[PDB]
Symmetry: C2
Subunit: 52 residues, 2 copies
């Protein structure tokens, strides 16, 4: 049974590792957006102070 | 002489005051160039890991 636990575990494993990227990908995305937006944030700040 | 020292101080004070503004505008310009350069550099970082 103990064997089959290792097998399973491997199946799972491939699944975890695989999971992993994805989490972060999305992670990475949260970042990505935050940055572009940040430059946007500045841009509105600019627009205004042009408007000043 | 004392009267004309204060007079000299006036002439100096308005010069000085205008000066202070000019510096912080160039100051603000140094910030501006770094901020925009940062976001470009970041787009290039982003690009690198799309291509991987």
């Amino acid at each position: 049974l103990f064997e089959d636990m290792g097998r399973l575990l491997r199946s799972e494993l491939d699944r975890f590792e695989r999971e992993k990227v994805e989490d972060f990908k999305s992670g990475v995305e949260t970042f990505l957006e935050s940055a572009v937006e940040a430059q946007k944030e500045l841009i509105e700040k600019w627009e205004t102070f042009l408007m000043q």
